[PDB]
């Protein structure tokens, strides 16, 4: 009847909270771990896990388990810090063809200056 959801020790860069949607419409929000009482036979209970990174982390994994049971939810974490901008592959005229286009900005080749590498 007493079901707790928790995870193994994590680095300071990861924060995880649990929302517990127990029976009888009893709901707990943003707690250190999942916690519900009762749980009738074959009656599913849902926990909403929220994971927040404080910086661009190195990939790693961790596990979530219900105390007293051998089940394991494997959680793999990856950073989402890269921008997928358009490059100049289909236009030799971009940046006057004298610099690299990086997320809207031209990084001119040596000897070239200007926001579009036009001068000098």
């Amino acid at each position: 009847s007493r079901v707790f959801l928790d995870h193994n020790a994590l680095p300071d860069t990861l924060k995880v909270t649990y929302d517990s949607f127990c029976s009888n419409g009893v709901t707990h929000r943003n707690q250190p771990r999942g916690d519900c009482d009762g749980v009738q036979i074959n009656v599913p209970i849902t926990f909403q896990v929220k994971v927040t990174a404080t910086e661009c982390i190195q990939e790693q994994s961790f596990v979530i388990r219900a105390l007293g049971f051998t089940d394991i939810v494997t959680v793999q974490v990856l950073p989402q810090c890269e921008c997928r901008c358009r490059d100049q592959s289909r236009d030799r005229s971009l940046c006057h063809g004298k610099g690299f286009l990086e997320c809207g900005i031209c990084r001119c080749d040596t000897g070239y200056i200007g926001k579009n590498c036009e001068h000098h």
């Binding site: 079901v3 959801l5 999942g34 519900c36 749980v39 036979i41 074959n42 009656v43 599913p44 209970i45 849902t46 926990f47 909403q48 896990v49 929220k50 994971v51 927040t52 990174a53 404080t54 910086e55 661009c56 982390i57 979530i64 388990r65 219900a66 049971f69 089940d71 394991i72 939810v73 494997t74 959680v75 793999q76 974490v77 990856l78 950073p79 989402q80 810090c81 890269e82 921008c83 997928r84 901008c85 358009r86 971009l94 990086e102 997320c103 809207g104 900005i105 926001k115 579009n116």
Partner: protein
């Protein structure tokens, strides 16, 4: 919905400035009297200045699950943007 950056010079630096920060990749977006940092702001702010929705870079936290006994799913992959929570539900039934 808030973005506090300081003289950011790239999209990466912008994204690292906060979860509400986005980057406009539109060519010539910068005016004569403006620093490249102008490209970095909240989504609504960039739209106001004419940046098209598809020119706004905004990597977002995502959760993908895969597939038992008491707990499900069994595998979860999270892509985490700093400061932006990724959410996924775990179901317990016995």
């Amino acid at each position: 919905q808030e973005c506090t950056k300081f003289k950011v010079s790239s999209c990466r630096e912008c994204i690292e400035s906060g979860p509400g920060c986005t980057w406009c990749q539109k060519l010539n977006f910068t005016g004569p009297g403006d620093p490249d940092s102008i490209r970095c702001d909240t989504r609504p702010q960039l739209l106001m200045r004419g940046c098209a929705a598809d020119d706004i870079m905004d990597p977002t936290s995502l959760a993908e699950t895969q597939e038992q006994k008491q707990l499900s799913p069994q595998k979860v992959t999270l892509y985490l943007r700093p400061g932006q929570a990724a959410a996924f539900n775990v179901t317990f039934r016995r």
